[PDB]
Amino acid sequence: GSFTQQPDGQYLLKPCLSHRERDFYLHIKDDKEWTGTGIIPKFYGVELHEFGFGELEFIRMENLMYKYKRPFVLDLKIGTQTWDPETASSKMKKRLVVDSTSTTTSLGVRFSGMERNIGEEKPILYSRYLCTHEVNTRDSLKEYIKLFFNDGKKYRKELVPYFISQLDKMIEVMKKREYKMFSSSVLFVYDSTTTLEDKKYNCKMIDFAHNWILSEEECTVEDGFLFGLNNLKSILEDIENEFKSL
């Protein structure tokens, strides 16, 4: 929402509309478990750029799809609720309904949108709003994730282990419960023209505008973030199992 959402430059320069995302990146900046594990985008720093009468703060981070020729993108929103203690009351009826009619309250993960580039471009776009109808069960979420790995010619079963390995690293850090994250996503991307060796594939946690730093502030409500990651991992392992029958 804060920038035109589509990437073949090196960077994303994301505006700071509140303190939370920038406080989080600054806080994990020296923690090798966040920054050497490859589980969040490479953080270049917070920067001031001219805006209005003065300056606006931005986060400079890596563009995860830099130099991708045929990008495939899947965004999965993580947690058992997508509201937090600061959510506006006028948004709450909708947040409550979407959380309960999607897989969010049951699995702690929900479909958020997908793009597949199968040579016939324009790309095929799958709306985030599919989550309360077409992708509203574990079985249908599994089918759409399989579809992400369908490059238009075959299932890219060889990429799935990378994705599980990434989720393992996320699980290991989030077990420590230093942060609560609401409305954050795991972004899965790959270039369908990649080989394994080219390493044009990525799996990162993103969007930290509603992150709470538990050593600094109270946040009583639960995020269910670790429950969601565990469920998503379990779905990917099911997919590995299912892709052997091919």
Ligand X SMILES: Nc1ncnc2c1ncn2[C@@H]1O[C@H](COP(=O)(O)OP(=O)(O)OP(=O)(O)O)[C@@H](O)[C@H]1O
62 is in an annotated binding site: yes
CA dist 162 and 123 (Å) reads 24
- Decide if 161 contacts 190 (C-beta within 8 A): no
64 is in an annotated binding site: yes
77 is in an annotated binding site: yes
Q: Does 75 bind ligand X (CB under 6 A)?
A: yes
- Decide if 52 contacts 61 (C-beta within 8 A): no
CA dist 86 and 54 (Å) reads 27
Rounded to a whole number of angstroms, the minimum distance from the CB of residue 128 to ligand 5MY is: 5
Q: Does 96 bind ligand 5MY (CB under 6 A)?
A: no
Read off the tokens for 55.
């300056």
For binding to Mg ion (CB under 5 A), which residues are involved?
Answer: 1, 207
Q: Does 107 bind ligand X (CB under 6 A)?
A: no
44 is in an annotated binding site: no
Of 127, 135, 72, the C-alpha closest to 103 is 135
Q: Does 206 bind ligand X (CB under 6 A)?
A: yes
- Decide if 63 contacts 7 (C-beta within 8 A): yes
Place of tokens 């929900």: 110
Rg of the chain in Å (alpha carbons)? 18
Residue from 16, 135, 173, 187 binding ligand X (CB under 6 A): 187
Q: Does 61 bind ligand X (CB under 6 A)?
A: yes
The contact set with ligand 5MY (CB under 6 A) reads: 1, 91, 94, 98, 128
Q: Which residues are annotated as a binding site for 1D-myo-inositol hexakisphosphate?
A: 5, 77, 91, 94-95, 128-129
The contact set with ligand X (CB under 6 A) reads: 1-3, 5, 7, 12, 41, 61-65, 73, 75, 187, 206-207, 209
